[PDB]
CSV table of C-alpha atoms in Angstrom, one decimal:
chain,number,residue,atom,x,y,z
T,1,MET,CA,0.4,30.9,-14.2
T,2,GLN,CA,3.5,28.6,-13.3
T,3,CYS,CA,6.7,29.7,-12.3
T,4,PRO,CA,9.7,29.1,-14.8
T,5,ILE,CA,12.2,26.5,-13.2
T,6,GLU,CA,15.1,29.4,-14.0
T,7,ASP,CA,12.9,31.9,-11.9
T,8,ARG,CA,12.2,29.4,-8.9
T,9,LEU,CA,16.2,28.7,-8.7
T,10,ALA,CA,17.0,32.5,-8.9
T,11,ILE,CA,14.7,33.4,-6.2
T,12,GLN,CA,16.0,30.6,-4.0
T,13,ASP,CA,19.4,31.8,-5.1
T,14,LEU,CA,18.3,35.1,-3.9
T,15,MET,CA,17.3,33.6,-0.6
T,16,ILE,CA,20.2,32.0,-0.1
T,17,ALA,CA,22.3,34.9,-0.8
T,18,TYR,CA,20.7,36.8,1.6
T,19,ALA,CA,21.7,34.2,4.5
T,20,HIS,CA,25.2,34.3,3.0
T,21,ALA,CA,25.3,38.1,3.6
T,22,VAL,CA,23.7,37.5,7.2
T,23,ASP,CA,26.4,34.9,7.7
T,24,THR,CA,29.3,37.1,7.1
T,25,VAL,CA,28.3,39.0,10.3
T,26,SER,CA,29.7,42.2,8.4
T,27,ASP,CA,28.9,42.9,4.9
T,28,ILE,CA,26.0,45.3,5.1
T,29,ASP,CA,26.4,46.3,1.3
T,30,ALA,CA,25.6,42.4,0.7
T,31,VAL,CA,22.6,42.6,2.6
T,32,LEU,CA,21.4,45.6,1.1
T,33,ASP,CA,21.9,44.1,-2.3
T,34,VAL,CA,19.4,41.7,-1.9
T,35,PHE,CA,16.4,44.0,-1.4
T,36,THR,CA,14.8,46.9,-3.4
T,37,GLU,CA,15.2,50.7,-1.9
T,38,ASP,CA,11.6,50.6,-0.8
T,39,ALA,CA,11.7,47.1,0.5
T,40,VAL,CA,9.4,46.4,3.6
T,41,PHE,CA,11.8,44.6,6.4
T,42,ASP,CA,9.1,43.2,8.7
T,43,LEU,CA,10.3,40.8,11.3
T,44,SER,CA,7.5,41.6,13.8
T,45,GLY,CA,6.3,38.0,13.4
T,46,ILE,CA,9.1,37.1,15.4
T,47,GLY,CA,9.0,40.3,18.1
T,48,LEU,CA,11.2,42.6,16.2
T,49,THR,CA,10.6,46.2,15.1
T,50,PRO,CA,9.6,46.5,11.6
T,51,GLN,CA,12.0,48.6,9.0
T,52,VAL,CA,11.4,50.1,5.6
T,53,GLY,CA,14.0,50.6,3.0
T,54,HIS,CA,17.9,50.7,2.8
T,55,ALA,CA,18.5,53.1,5.4
T,56,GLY,CA,16.2,51.1,7.9
T,57,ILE,CA,17.9,47.6,7.0
T,58,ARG,CA,21.2,49.1,7.3
T,59,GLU,CA,20.4,50.3,10.9
T,60,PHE,CA,19.1,47.0,11.8
T,61,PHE,CA,22.4,45.2,10.6
T,62,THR,CA,24.8,47.7,11.9
T,63,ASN,CA,23.3,46.9,15.5
T,64,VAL,CA,23.3,43.1,14.9
T,65,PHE,CA,26.5,43.1,13.1
T,66,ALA,CA,28.0,45.0,16.4
T,67,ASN,CA,26.3,42.5,18.7
T,68,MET,CA,27.2,39.2,17.2
T,69,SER,CA,30.0,36.9,17.0
T,70,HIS,CA,28.7,33.9,15.0
T,71,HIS,CA,25.7,33.4,12.6
T,72,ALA,CA,24.5,30.6,10.6
T,73,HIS,CA,20.9,30.9,8.6
T,74,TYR,CA,20.3,27.4,7.0
T,75,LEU,CA,17.1,27.1,4.7
T,76,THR,CA,15.0,24.5,3.5
T,77,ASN,CA,11.7,23.8,2.3
T,78,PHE,CA,11.4,26.3,-0.6
T,79,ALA,CA,7.9,26.6,-2.1
T,80,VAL,CA,7.0,29.1,-4.7
T,81,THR,CA,3.8,30.3,-3.3
T,82,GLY,CA,2.5,32.7,-5.7
T,83,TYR,CA,4.1,34.0,-9.3
T,84,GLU,CA,2.6,36.8,-11.4
T,85,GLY,CA,5.3,37.1,-13.9
T,86,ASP,CA,7.1,40.3,-12.6
T,87,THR,CA,6.5,39.5,-9.1
T,88,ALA,CA,6.7,36.2,-6.9
T,89,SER,CA,6.4,35.0,-3.5
T,90,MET,CA,8.1,32.2,-1.9
T,91,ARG,CA,8.5,30.4,1.6
T,92,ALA,CA,11.4,29.0,3.0
T,93,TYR,CA,12.0,26.9,6.5
T,94,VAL,CA,15.0,28.6,8.7
T,95,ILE,CA,17.3,27.2,11.4
T,96,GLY,CA,18.7,30.6,12.3
T,97,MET,CA,21.5,30.2,14.9
T,98,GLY,CA,23.7,33.0,16.5
T,99,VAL,CA,26.2,33.6,19.6
T,100,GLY,CA,26.7,37.1,20.7
T,101,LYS,CA,29.8,38.7,21.4
T,102,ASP,CA,28.2,38.3,24.8
T,103,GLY,CA,28.2,34.9,24.8
T,104,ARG,CA,24.7,34.4,24.4
T,105,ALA,CA,23.0,32.0,22.0
T,106,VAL,CA,19.7,31.8,19.9
T,107,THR,CA,18.2,29.5,17.7
T,108,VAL,CA,15.1,30.6,15.8
T,109,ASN,CA,13.2,27.4,13.7
T,110,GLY,CA,10.6,29.4,12.0
T,111,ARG,CA,9.9,30.5,8.3
T,112,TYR,CA,10.9,33.2,6.0
T,113,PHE,CA,8.5,34.6,3.7
T,114,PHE,CA,9.9,36.6,0.6
T,115,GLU,CA,7.9,38.9,-1.8
T,116,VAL,CA,10.1,39.5,-4.8
T,117,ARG,CA,10.2,41.5,-8.2
T,118,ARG,CA,12.4,41.3,-11.1
T,119,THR,CA,14.5,43.9,-12.0
T,120,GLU,CA,16.9,44.9,-14.6
T,121,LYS,CA,19.6,43.7,-11.8
T,122,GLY,CA,17.6,40.4,-11.3
T,123,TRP,CA,15.1,39.3,-8.7
T,124,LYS,CA,15.2,41.5,-5.4
T,125,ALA,CA,13.2,41.5,-2.3
T,126,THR,CA,10.2,43.8,-2.0
T,127,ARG,CA,8.9,42.5,1.5
T,128,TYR,CA,10.4,39.9,4.0
T,129,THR,CA,8.4,38.4,6.9
T,130,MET,CA,8.9,35.5,9.5
T,131,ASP,CA,7.4,33.6,12.1
T,132,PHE,CA,8.2,30.5,14.3
T,133,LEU,CA,7.5,27.0,13.8
T,134,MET,CA,9.1,26.2,17.5
T,135,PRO,CA,9.3,28.6,20.5
T,136,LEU,CA,12.4,30.7,20.3
T,137,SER,CA,15.4,29.0,21.8
T,138,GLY,CA,17.5,31.7,23.5
T,139,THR,CA,17.5,35.5,23.0
T,140,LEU,CA,16.7,38.3,20.4
T,141,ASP,CA,18.1,40.6,22.4
T,142,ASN,CA,21.1,41.0,20.4
T,143,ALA,CA,19.0,41.9,17.3
T,144,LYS,CA,17.1,44.6,19.5
D,1,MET,CA,29.7,31.7,-18.0
D,2,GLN,CA,26.3,30.4,-16.3
D,3,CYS,CA,26.2,26.9,-15.4
D,4,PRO,CA,23.3,25.2,-16.7
D,5,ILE,CA,20.5,24.0,-14.5
D,6,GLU,CA,21.4,20.0,-15.4
D,7,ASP,CA,24.9,20.8,-14.3
D,8,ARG,CA,24.1,22.4,-11.2
D,9,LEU,CA,21.9,19.7,-10.0
D,10,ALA,CA,24.3,17.2,-11.2
D,11,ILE,CA,27.0,18.9,-8.8
D,12,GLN,CA,24.8,19.1,-6.0
D,13,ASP,CA,23.5,15.5,-6.5
D,14,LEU,CA,27.5,14.7,-6.1
D,15,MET,CA,27.6,16.3,-3.0
D,16,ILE,CA,24.5,14.8,-1.4
D,17,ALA,CA,26.1,11.2,-2.8
D,18,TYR,CA,29.3,12.2,-0.7
D,19,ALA,CA,27.0,12.7,2.3
D,20,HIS,CA,24.9,9.4,1.9
D,21,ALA,CA,28.7,7.6,1.4
D,22,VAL,CA,29.6,9.1,4.8
D,23,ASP,CA,26.5,8.4,6.3
D,24,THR,CA,26.4,5.0,5.7
D,25,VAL,CA,29.2,4.8,8.2
D,26,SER,CA,31.0,2.0,6.4
D,27,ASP,CA,31.1,2.1,2.5
D,28,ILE,CA,34.5,3.3,1.6
D,29,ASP,CA,34.3,2.5,-2.1
D,30,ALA,CA,31.3,4.9,-2.5
D,31,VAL,CA,33.0,7.7,-0.9
D,32,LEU,CA,35.9,7.2,-3.3
D,33,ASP,CA,33.8,7.4,-6.0
D,34,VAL,CA,32.9,10.9,-5.4
D,35,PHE,CA,36.2,11.9,-6.1
D,36,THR,CA,39.3,12.1,-8.6
D,37,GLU,CA,42.1,9.9,-8.1
D,38,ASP,CA,44.3,13.1,-7.4
D,39,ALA,CA,41.5,14.8,-5.5
D,40,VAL,CA,42.6,16.9,-2.6
D,41,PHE,CA,40.8,16.5,0.5
D,42,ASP,CA,41.8,19.2,2.8
D,43,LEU,CA,39.8,19.3,6.2
D,44,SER,CA,42.3,21.6,7.7
D,45,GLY,CA,39.7,24.1,7.7
D,46,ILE,CA,37.9,22.5,10.9
D,47,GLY,CA,41.1,21.3,12.3
D,48,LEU,CA,41.8,17.7,10.4
D,49,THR,CA,44.8,16.5,8.8
D,50,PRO,CA,44.4,17.1,4.8
D,51,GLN,CA,45.0,14.2,2.3
D,52,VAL,CA,45.4,13.9,-1.0
D,53,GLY,CA,44.3,10.9,-3.4
D,54,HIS,CA,42.3,7.9,-3.1
D,55,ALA,CA,45.1,6.2,-1.1
D,56,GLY,CA,44.6,9.2,1.8
D,57,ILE,CA,41.1,9.3,1.6
D,58,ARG,CA,40.9,5.4,2.1
D,59,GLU,CA,43.1,6.0,5.4
D,60,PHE,CA,41.2,8.8,6.4
D,61,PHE,CA,37.9,6.8,6.5
D,62,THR,CA,39.1,3.6,7.6
D,63,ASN,CA,39.8,5.5,11.1
D,64,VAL,CA,36.6,7.4,10.9
D,65,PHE,CA,34.3,4.6,10.0
D,66,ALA,CA,36.3,2.4,13.0
D,67,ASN,CA,35.7,5.0,15.4
D,68,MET,CA,32.0,6.4,14.7
D,69,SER,CA,28.7,4.5,15.5
D,70,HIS,CA,26.1,7.1,13.8
D,71,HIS,CA,26.6,10.1,11.1
D,72,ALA,CA,24.4,12.4,9.6
D,73,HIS,CA,25.5,15.3,7.4
D,74,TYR,CA,22.8,17.7,6.3
D,75,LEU,CA,23.4,19.5,3.6
D,76,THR,CA,21.6,22.9,2.6
D,77,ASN,CA,22.0,26.4,0.6
D,78,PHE,CA,23.7,25.1,-2.3
D,79,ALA,CA,25.5,27.9,-4.4
D,80,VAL,CA,27.1,27.8,-7.6
D,81,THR,CA,30.5,30.0,-7.0
D,82,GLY,CA,32.3,29.2,-10.3
D,83,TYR,CA,31.6,27.7,-13.5
D,84,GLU,CA,34.1,27.4,-16.3
D,85,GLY,CA,32.8,24.9,-18.8
D,86,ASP,CA,34.5,21.6,-17.9
D,87,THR,CA,35.1,22.6,-14.1
D,88,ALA,CA,32.7,24.4,-11.5
D,89,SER,CA,32.7,25.2,-8.1
D,90,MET,CA,29.7,25.0,-5.5
D,91,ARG,CA,29.4,25.7,-2.1
D,92,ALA,CA,26.9,24.2,0.8
D,93,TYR,CA,26.2,24.6,4.4
D,94,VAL,CA,26.5,21.3,6.7
D,95,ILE,CA,24.9,20.4,9.8
D,96,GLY,CA,27.4,17.5,10.5
D,97,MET,CA,26.3,15.5,13.3
D,98,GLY,CA,28.3,12.3,14.8
D,99,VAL,CA,28.4,10.1,17.9
D,100,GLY,CA,31.4,8.2,18.5
D,101,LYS,CA,31.5,4.4,19.4
D,102,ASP,CA,32.9,5.8,22.6
D,103,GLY,CA,29.7,7.6,23.0
D,104,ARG,CA,30.6,11.3,22.4
D,105,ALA,CA,28.8,13.7,20.1
D,106,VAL,CA,30.0,16.2,17.6
D,107,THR,CA,27.9,18.5,15.5
D,108,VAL,CA,29.7,20.9,12.8
D,109,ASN,CA,27.8,23.8,11.8
D,110,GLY,CA,29.8,24.9,8.7
D,111,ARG,CA,30.3,25.0,5.1
D,112,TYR,CA,31.4,22.7,2.3
D,113,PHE,CA,33.4,24.1,-0.8
D,114,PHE,CA,33.6,21.6,-3.4
D,115,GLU,CA,35.7,21.9,-6.8
D,116,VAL,CA,34.7,19.6,-9.5
D,117,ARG,CA,35.4,18.4,-13.1
D,118,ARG,CA,33.3,17.1,-15.8
D,119,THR,CA,34.7,13.3,-16.3
D,120,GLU,CA,33.8,10.5,-18.5
D,121,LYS,CA,31.8,9.1,-15.4
D,122,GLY,CA,30.3,12.6,-14.7
D,123,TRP,CA,31.2,15.3,-12.4
D,124,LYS,CA,33.7,14.5,-9.9
D,125,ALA,CA,35.4,16.2,-7.0
D,126,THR,CA,38.9,17.5,-7.5
D,127,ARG,CA,38.9,19.6,-4.4
D,128,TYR,CA,36.9,19.9,-0.8
D,129,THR,CA,37.8,21.9,1.9
D,130,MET,CA,35.3,23.2,5.0
D,131,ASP,CA,35.1,25.9,7.4
D,132,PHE,CA,33.1,26.7,10.5
D,133,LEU,CA,29.8,29.1,10.8
D,134,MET,CA,29.6,28.3,14.4
D,135,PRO,CA,32.2,27.0,17.0
D,136,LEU,CA,32.6,23.2,17.0
D,137,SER,CA,29.8,21.3,19.3
D,138,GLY,CA,31.7,18.3,20.6
D,139,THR,CA,34.8,16.8,19.5
D,140,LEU,CA,36.6,15.7,16.4
D,141,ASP,CA,39.1,13.4,18.1
D,142,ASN,CA,37.0,10.7,16.4
D,143,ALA,CA,38.2,11.7,13.0
D,144,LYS,CA,41.9,12.7,14.0
K,1,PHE,CA,22.8,0.1,-19.2
K,2,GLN,CA,21.6,3.6,-17.7
K,3,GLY,CA,18.5,3.6,-16.0
K,4,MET,CA,15.6,5.8,-17.5
K,5,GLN,CA,16.7,9.5,-16.1
K,6,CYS,CA,14.3,11.3,-14.3
K,7,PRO,CA,13.2,15.0,-15.9
K,8,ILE,CA,14.1,17.9,-13.8
K,9,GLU,CA,10.0,18.6,-13.9
K,10,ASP,CA,9.1,15.2,-12.5
K,11,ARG,CA,12.3,15.6,-9.8
K,12,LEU,CA,11.0,18.8,-8.5
K,13,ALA,CA,7.2,17.9,-8.7
K,14,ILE,CA,8.3,14.9,-6.2
K,15,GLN,CA,10.4,17.4,-4.0
K,16,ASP,CA,7.5,19.6,-3.7
K,17,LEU,CA,5.1,17.1,-3.1
K,18,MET,CA,7.4,15.7,0.3
K,19,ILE,CA,7.8,19.6,1.3
K,20,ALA,CA,3.8,19.9,0.7
K,21,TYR,CA,3.7,16.8,3.0
K,22,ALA,CA,6.1,18.4,5.8
K,23,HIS,CA,4.0,21.6,5.6
K,24,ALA,CA,0.6,19.5,6.0
K,25,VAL,CA,2.5,18.0,9.3
K,26,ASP,CA,3.5,21.1,10.5
K,27,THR,CA,0.2,22.5,10.3
K,28,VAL,CA,-0.5,20.6,13.3
K,29,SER,CA,-4.0,20.3,12.0
K,30,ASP,CA,-4.7,19.9,8.6
K,31,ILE,CA,-5.7,16.2,7.9
K,32,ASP,CA,-6.8,16.7,4.5
K,33,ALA,CA,-3.7,18.3,3.2
K,34,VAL,CA,-1.8,15.4,4.5
K,35,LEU,CA,-4.3,12.8,3.0
K,36,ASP,CA,-3.9,14.6,-0.2
K,37,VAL,CA,-0.2,13.6,-0.9
K,38,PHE,CA,-1.2,9.8,-0.8
K,39,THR,CA,-2.9,7.7,-2.9
K,40,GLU,CA,-6.2,6.0,-1.7
K,41,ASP,CA,-4.2,2.7,-1.2
K,42,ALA,CA,-0.9,4.1,0.1
K,43,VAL,CA,1.3,2.2,2.7
K,44,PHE,CA,2.2,4.6,5.4
K,45,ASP,CA,4.8,2.4,7.2
K,46,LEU,CA,6.4,4.1,10.0
K,47,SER,CA,7.9,0.8,11.5
K,48,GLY,CA,11.3,1.9,10.7
K,49,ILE,CA,11.4,4.7,13.8
K,50,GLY,CA,9.5,2.2,15.5
K,51,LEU,CA,5.6,3.1,14.7
K,52,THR,CA,2.8,1.1,13.9
K,53,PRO,CA,2.2,0.7,10.0
K,54,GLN,CA,-1.1,2.2,8.6
K,55,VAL,CA,-2.6,1.6,5.2
K,56,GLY,CA,-5.1,3.8,3.1
K,57,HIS,CA,-6.6,7.2,4.1
K,58,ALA,CA,-8.5,5.6,6.7
K,59,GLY,CA,-5.1,4.3,8.4
K,60,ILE,CA,-3.3,7.8,8.0
K,61,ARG,CA,-6.5,9.8,9.4
K,62,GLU,CA,-6.3,7.8,12.5
K,63,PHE,CA,-2.3,8.3,12.8
K,64,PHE,CA,-2.9,12.2,12.5
K,65,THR,CA,-6.0,12.4,14.6
K,66,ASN,CA,-3.8,11.2,17.2
K,67,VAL,CA,-0.5,13.4,16.5
K,68,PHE,CA,-2.6,16.4,16.0
K,69,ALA,CA,-4.1,16.0,19.4
K,70,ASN,CA,-1.1,15.5,21.2
K,71,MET,CA,1.4,17.8,19.9
K,72,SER,CA,1.4,21.6,20.2
K,73,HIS,CA,4.1,22.7,17.7
K,74,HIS,CA,5.9,20.6,15.0
K,75,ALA,CA,8.7,21.2,12.2
K,76,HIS,CA,9.9,19.0,9.5
K,77,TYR,CA,12.9,20.1,7.8
K,78,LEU,CA,13.7,18.2,4.6
K,79,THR,CA,17.0,18.2,2.9
K,80,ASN,CA,19.4,16.1,0.7
K,81,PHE,CA,17.0,15.1,-2.0
K,82,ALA,CA,17.8,12.1,-3.9
K,83,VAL,CA,16.0,10.2,-6.7
K,84,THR,CA,16.5,6.5,-6.0
K,85,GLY,CA,14.6,5.0,-8.7
K,86,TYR,CA,12.8,5.9,-12.3
K,87,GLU,CA,10.5,4.0,-14.1
K,88,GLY,CA,8.5,6.5,-15.8
K,89,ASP,CA,5.0,6.5,-14.3
K,90,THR,CA,6.7,5.6,-10.9
K,91,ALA,CA,10.0,6.9,-9.1
K,92,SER,CA,11.1,7.0,-5.8
K,93,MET,CA,13.1,9.7,-3.6
K,94,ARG,CA,15.1,9.9,-0.6
K,95,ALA,CA,15.3,13.0,1.9
K,96,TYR,CA,16.8,13.6,5.2
K,97,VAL,CA,14.5,15.2,7.8
K,98,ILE,CA,14.7,17.0,11.3
K,99,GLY,CA,11.8,16.0,12.6
K,100,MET,CA,10.8,18.2,15.7
K,101,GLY,CA,8.0,18.6,17.9
K,102,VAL,CA,6.9,19.7,21.2
K,103,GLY,CA,3.7,17.9,22.8
K,104,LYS,CA,1.1,19.6,24.8
K,105,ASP,CA,2.4,17.9,27.7
K,106,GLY,CA,5.7,19.8,27.0
K,107,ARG,CA,7.8,16.9,26.1
K,108,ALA,CA,10.3,17.6,23.2
K,109,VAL,CA,11.0,15.1,20.3
K,110,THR,CA,13.4,15.5,17.4
K,111,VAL,CA,13.8,12.6,14.8
K,112,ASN,CA,17.4,12.8,12.5
K,113,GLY,CA,16.2,10.3,9.9
K,114,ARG,CA,15.4,9.9,6.3
K,115,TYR,CA,12.3,9.7,4.4
K,116,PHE,CA,11.9,7.2,1.7
K,117,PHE,CA,8.9,8.0,-0.7
K,118,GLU,CA,7.7,5.6,-3.5
K,119,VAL,CA,5.2,7.7,-5.9
K,120,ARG,CA,3.0,7.3,-8.8
K,121,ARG,CA,2.1,9.9,-11.8
K,122,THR,CA,-1.7,10.3,-11.2
K,123,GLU,CA,-4.1,12.2,-13.0
K,124,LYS,CA,-3.8,14.8,-10.1
K,125,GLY,CA,0.1,14.8,-10.1
K,126,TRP,CA,2.8,12.7,-8.5
K,127,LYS,CA,1.3,11.0,-5.1
K,128,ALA,CA,2.8,8.7,-2.7
K,129,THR,CA,2.2,5.1,-2.6
K,130,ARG,CA,4.5,4.1,0.1
K,131,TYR,CA,6.5,5.9,2.7
K,132,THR,CA,8.7,4.4,5.1
K,133,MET,CA,11.4,5.9,7.4
K,134,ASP,CA,14.7,5.2,9.2
K,135,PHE,CA,17.0,7.0,11.7
K,136,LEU,CA,20.4,8.6,10.9
K,137,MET,CA,20.7,9.2,14.8
K,138,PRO,CA,19.4,7.7,18.1
K,139,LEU,CA,16.0,9.1,18.6
K,140,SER,CA,15.7,12.2,20.8
K,141,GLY,CA,12.5,12.2,22.9
K,142,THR,CA,9.6,10.0,22.6
K,143,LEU,CA,7.4,9.3,19.8
K,144,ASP,CA,4.6,8.5,22.8
K,145,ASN,CA,2.8,11.5,21.4
K,146,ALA,CA,2.8,9.7,17.8
K,147,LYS,CA,1.5,6.7,19.6
């Protein structure tokens, strides 16, 4: 079945909201609000240890936010890759830029893969994975 | 108040029209058509001198277009941040690239903030501000 | 006199076709998926960024057989989508591209440019009948792995 335009834009907006929360370099609560409590936050596709649940996502961003100075996550090329009414999936391209407090830059040219579920507070992410389109530029050490 | 999809897309289109006008590196009338007659064009958030009104905005671009050779303003991550019916607010990320006639490059990784009004000729910008997501690469001297 | 307004469903369908084209290019392999974007008769004319024009599926297939043979990685980011024309069963759309690649020879390329798609409604949906490009910034790298 076809994804309603309303839901396509909602899911895009969730992803853009996640980018905004990361790009604060501070607002963990805003990051967590994107995800269900049980969410799989699995960035093993770019070489980072998987995390599950809000506690794991919090740990991840406590570290990232402590280590990073500036961030910008540009999301483009949104495509609905599945829709089953109460659940959906969406792909986007990312230009994920950062500079650490240690001065070291990073740019990821890759893809975000979101799985989402319709909840009483809107669409939320149940699973998030990634991969590369280009070889990593710089370092992911400040996210480890 | 939720912004209708038709208006959301119209406001995005306006912002993309602005980027197109800037990227002509010549069409000041097209730039001015984005803006209300009394619009605030305030780029102080990226270090430039603010202007108010079409005369000011024309001055700003007479200089920029005199000094620049090539422009590209990629806009992404659009988000409605306010909607009051006849007024609205939208955020976008920009990758703002330029090369001067003097050969000096600039890239702004930042954000646009548009405030818009519904007019007899469609949505138009009443205020435009910016800030950075990453430290400025290159120079904004060709826009001063 | 207002031109005929492009319906939202069609605007999104045409955007999606262009994003599908980028996806196909970014497989660095799937010529069939690339060709699915175009009418059999399509004009594939990238002379605006310095490449030789092609016409039809045969020509597009030749083009990508070469590109895919020479390239290691691709990323084609498309942004600033704008409907530039709509006549009902035909339309046109502009997009900005950040077209990135690295060759098997290790040479990088980045195109900062624009895509211009002219599309037609078919029984299998909107398809591209003409595709052209130009630059917003001076080419970074070579398009020799696309030549």
